[PDB]
Amino acid sequence: VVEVPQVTWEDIGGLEDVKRELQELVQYPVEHPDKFLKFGMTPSKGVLFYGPPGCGKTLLAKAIANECQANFISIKGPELLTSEANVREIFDKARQAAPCVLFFDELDSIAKAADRVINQILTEMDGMSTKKNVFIIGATNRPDIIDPAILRPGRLDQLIYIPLPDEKSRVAILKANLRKSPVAKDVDLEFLAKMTNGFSGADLTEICQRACKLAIRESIESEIRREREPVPEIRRDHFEEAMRFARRSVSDNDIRKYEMFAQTLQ
Ligand SMILES: Nc1ncnc2c1ncn2[C@@H]1O[C@H](COP(=O)(O)OP(=O)(O)O)[C@@H](O)[C@H]1O
Ligand SMILES: N#CCC(=O)Nc1ccc(Cl)cc1
Ligand code: NA
């Protein structure tokens, strides 16, 4: 299915550096078209996100579409295998869907025949002007194996690091995930942030989902009882139980590799 996504910049905790750089990447061509003439800038054709898994790459690709009132078409790495006109049939359906975001997910896998399902993507890329109104976003957890041809000028213009959330970003992920839940006043997410060092956004969302299931499973069983003879809330004790089921999903060793990779490019 092809639609305009529903997630907004507001559903994303942290990453505010990336957020304002993404906005001006798409807002500048349309808010000052009258200065993109004078000096002769050809607008951005694409970006590439890299970093640990479950830290917001897919959400910023949807949020970019929601901001541009664009359709979103999401194709996932291994399903490109049967088979080269696949790379031409998804591109035509995105051209058909303009204005559109084409999202290439999980193809660190492709980076190890498969040889030129890459080159068919690079040739499809170079043969699609900015005038078609398609914006390509790619994502990977293996930044050590990008073939640097996809980042040559004319293709995926920028490479952006989407890292594990620091203490201040965990408070914002928790707040953004519960923005529309009735959470009890005794709940302190600042304290929940200090206790979740190394947790990804995915991990933080899970903890939010378990406390939610408990607070309403408790709701059904109680007035099922108090009918034998007013909104309920998620409380501090629902979050306590929900944390026995809680530990990180990204290892310390792989956290060092990402930190080494991002840091060497300043
Ligand atoms: N920065 C964030 N703010 C709020 N929720 C997040 C954040 N990062 C991850 N999540 C949660 O984890 C889920 C998976 O994230 P996703 O963006 O698909 O990760 P990636 O694409 O980096 O593998 C999201 O749907 C969301 O529930
Ligand atoms: N060792 C090894 C490879 C591995 O399994 N994962 C991995 C590879 C690169 C980065 Cl930058 C992060 C994690
Ligand atoms: Na991932």
Q: Identify which of 166, 205, 254 to mutate to test ligand 1's pocket (most ligand atoms within 8 A of the CB).
A: 205
**Tokens standing for 56?**
């917001």
The experimental technique used to determine this model is: X-ray
Give how far the C-alpha of residue 40 lies from the chain's centroid of Cα atoms, to the nearest Å: 31
Residue with tokens 């058909």: 96
Domain ranges of the chain: 1-164, 165-266
**Tokens standing for 12?**
């994303």
Q: Hey, do 1-164 and 165-266 end up sharing a CATH topology, with the first three levels equal?
A: no
CATH level 2 (architecture), domain 1-164: 3-Layer(aba) Sandwich (3.40)
CA–CA gap between residue 78 and residue 106 (Å, rounded) = 8
Any idea what the Cα angle at residue 200 is, between residues 197 and 205, rounded to 5°? 110
Do 99 and 29 form a contact (C-beta atoms < 8 A)? no
Ligand 1 lining (C-beta closer than 6 Å):
12-15, 53-59, 139, 173, 176-177, 201-202, 205
> Is the distance from the beta carbon of residue 258 to the nearest atom of ligand 2 less than 6 Å?
yes
Q: Which amino acid is at 78?
A: P
Ligand nearest to the CA of residue 55, numbered in listed order = 1
CA–CA gap between residue 199 and residue 212 (Å, rounded) = 19
**Tokens standing for 261?**
């990779």
Interval between CA 57 and ligand 3 midpoint (Å): 8
CA–CA gap between residue 95 and residue 92 (Å, rounded) = 5
Any idea what the Cα angle at residue 74 is, between residues 82 and 90, rounded to 5°? 50
Q: Collect contacts of 201-204 with beta carbons under 8 A, ≥24 apart.
A: 201/13, 201/54, 201/55, 201/56, 201/165, 201/173, 202/53, 202/54, 202/55, 202/249, 203/54, 203/246, 203/247, 203/248, 203/249, 204/165, 204/170, 204/173, 204/174, 204/177
β-strands 71-76, 100-105: how paired? parallel
SS3 of the chain: the string is CCECCCCCHHHCCCCHHHHHHHHHHHHHHHHCHHHHCCCCCCCCCEEEEECCCCCCHHHHHHHHHHHCCCEEEEEEHHHHCCCCHHHHHHHHHHHHCCCEEEEEECCCCCCCCHHHHHHHHHHHHHCCCHHHCEEEEEEECCHHHCCCCCCCCCCCCEEEECCCCCHHHHHHHHHHHCCCCCECCCCCHHHHHHCCCCCCHHHHHHHHHHHHHHHHHHHHHHHCCCCCCCCCCECHHHHHHHHHCCCCCCCHHHHHHHHHHHHHCC
| Residue 15 dihedral angles phi and psi, to the nearest 5° | 60, 30
Is 45 marked as a binding-site residue? no
The HSE-up count of residue 112 (CA atoms within 13 Å, CB side) is: 7
> Is the distance from the beta carbon of residue 223 to the nearest atom of ligand 2 less than 6 Å?
no
| Domain 165-266 classification at class level | mainly alpha
